[PDB]
Amino acid sequence: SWAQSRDEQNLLQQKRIWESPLLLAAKENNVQALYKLLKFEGCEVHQKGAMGETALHIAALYDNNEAAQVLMEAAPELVFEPMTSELYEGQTALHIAVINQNVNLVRALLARGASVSARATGSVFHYRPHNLIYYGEHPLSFAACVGSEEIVRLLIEHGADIRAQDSLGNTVLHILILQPNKTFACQMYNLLLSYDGGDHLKSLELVPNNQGLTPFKLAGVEGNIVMFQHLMQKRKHIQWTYGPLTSTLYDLTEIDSSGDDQSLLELIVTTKKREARQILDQTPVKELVSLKWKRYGRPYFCVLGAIYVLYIICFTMCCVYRPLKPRITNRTNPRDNTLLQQKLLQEAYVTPKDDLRLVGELVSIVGAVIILLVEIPDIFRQTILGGPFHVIIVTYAFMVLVTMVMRLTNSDGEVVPMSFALVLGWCNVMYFARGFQMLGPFTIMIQKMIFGDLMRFCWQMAVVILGFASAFYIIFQTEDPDELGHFYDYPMALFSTFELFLTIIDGPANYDVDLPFMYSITYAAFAIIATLLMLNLLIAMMGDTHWRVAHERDELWRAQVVATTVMLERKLPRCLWPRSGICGREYGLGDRWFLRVEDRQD
Ligand SMILES: C[C@@H]1NC(=O)N[C@@H]1CCCCCC(=O)O
Ligand SMILES: [Ca+2]
């Protein structure tokens, strides 16, 4: 493995230090022994250790300034020498002195003129999980991360370019946000901005990542609240202060739209980082997504919801009435348990009532491709948060097409693909349960919250039985209802599935008869979903009062509503859903869009 190798190497290095008396005296800070080695013997002062390190690199590790100065006085060319090893390719004796915050050694190394642009591309320095710290590749970046402002100043005085990026395209400002001590990195963040070019052109806070992220945008994705709040200070202007009230104005530039992915909100909803979800609760953002949902967001979800309900309830209205004929085959006693009256008329134009189902069948097709026309071109440019609605809706429209392909071929098994589209269409409309109110001046958790989680179940339950009672009816609409007639007509198919949803009915079972291939599959999935919804509901009934974890269930649901709010903003045209905030083009303050927020203090 790779972990053992460096563990072998770190142990291998200490051996060469123990062997090489120069490296040993450099580690032990033996000034008397060093003068014996370099002056009375002429030992290899260019002695490369096991990590390709010089005696000065060792003296820089263990803060031995006396021994380190002996190596520099007797050999001043060791300063420029970097370590040649693969794990440490690039690190010089300056990076070590900056890491250990040895101000006098750094002052002495800059005195002899050490390169402040020495990039350290060693394998141990890469931004990888096995590496504990990630400080970058330049000695200035090492100084900012250790919090030594005195070293930072000394490096800038020697021309340390603050605009320098590492291999991952991160400037020194990006690296500070990734450090744990965000409380202390805020102070170090301002110190580097003071050395900026002072021009509107080429601002260091505007320099993007290799993945196209500025220090602002990265702080939101990384979930660094203190850096995000700090960065917000220079992104807002206070209009006025009227007693307690303070009407501030937020820039709202790198936090909205006008980009394929140039948008912080799209990054928060798609990240695998759980910490980043706390960003959209901040005081320039929690007002934004709330206004996007309160108007234009909440109504269009119900409009598209009612359309999708009428779409699915029509597809079922055409599924309940399908071609019916007796089995017209003497094969009713061969396999006597057989009891099918299979029916595929496959060409009937009997149109007193079939023209009504003919136009309905075309609605089921033109919408399924429309579902594909709004989902298939979206997969090319996938995270559920967010709901698996998108995954379930595309397979539904895939099933309607298969049922269409199962038609025009008269395949005996057109019940199998038509059944999967029934539950996939309905179970997708329980995804429409999220809505109503997400406002929260007071994040309210009481009896209202238990009642809130119970009504989603009633919505989830009523939807599930509609998708499965219609399914169970189709399966047994063909068979003979004299034996196992739990679903002989639609009102009894619902009442049976309703009863079976609560496990009161024994469940349709008959063993002297052979039942269709679909009943065992559908009822097995029915028992799992029906118990999970009852099991999931039992947690919400208790997970609301035992602790403030109701706020944890609440805040994740808001992120689901916010993730849906960003979903309704991509495919919808521009004539609807106007842009958030107010533009800055006459009145003159643009060319950005600003959000007006006023708060009160007590
Ligand atoms: C101690 C080792 N000896 C040495 O001369 N350089 C190494 C420094 C170790 C730093 C490893 C930083 C990391 O985990 O990436
Ligand atoms: Ca029973």
Residue numbers in the entry: 28 to 408, 417 to 637
From the paper:
TRPV6 and its close relative TRPV5 are TRP channels that are distinctly Ca2+-selective and play an important role in calcium homeostasis. Structurally, TRP channels are assemblies of four identical subunits arranged symmetrically around the pore axis. The transmembrane domain of TRP channels includes six transmembrane helices (S1–S6) and a pore loop (P-loop) between S5 and S6. S5, P-loop and S6 form the KcsA channel-like pore domain, with the ion conduction pathway lined by the S6 helices and extracellular loops connecting the P-loop helix to S5 and S6.
Compared to wild type, TRPV6cryst has a 59-residue C-terminal truncation and four point mutations, including L495Q, which resides in the S5 transmembrane helix. This L495Q substitution, which was a spontaneous mutation that occurred during gene synthesis, was originally included in TRPV6cryst because it expressed at 3-fold higher levels than the same construct with the substitution reverted to the native leucine (TRPV6*). We reproduced crystals of TRPV6cryst and confirmed its non-swapped conformation. Notably, we were able to collect new crystallographic data, where both the S4–S5 and S6-TRP helix connectivity in TRPV6cryst is unambiguously resolved in the 2Fo-Fc and Fo-Fc omit maps, in stark contrast to our previous data, where density for thirteen residues in S4–S5 linker (F471-Q483) was missing. Similarly, both the 2Fo-Fc and robust Fo-Fc omit maps for TRPV6* demonstrated completely different connectivity of transmembrane domains compared to TRPV6cryst. These structural data therefore suggest that the single leucine L495 to glutamine substitution in S5 is responsible for the absence of domain swapping in TRPV6cryst. By contrast, in TRPV6cryst, Q495 is rotated by ~120° with respect to the orientation of L495 in TRPV6* and forms polar interactions with the hydrophilic pocket formed by S4–S6 and the TRP helix of the same subunit. Disruption of these hydrophobic interactions leads to the non-swapped fold. Apart from the distinct connectivity between S4 and S5 as well as S6 and TRP helix, the domain-swapped TRPV6* and non-swapped TRPV6cryst structures were almost identical. Despite these gross similarities, kinetic analysis indicated the rate of increase in Fura-2 signal is faster in TRPV6* compared to TRPV6cryst. Therefore, the Ca2+ entry function is somewhat compromised in the non-swapped TRPV6cryst construct, presumably due to differences in allosteric communication between the pore domain and the rest of the protein.
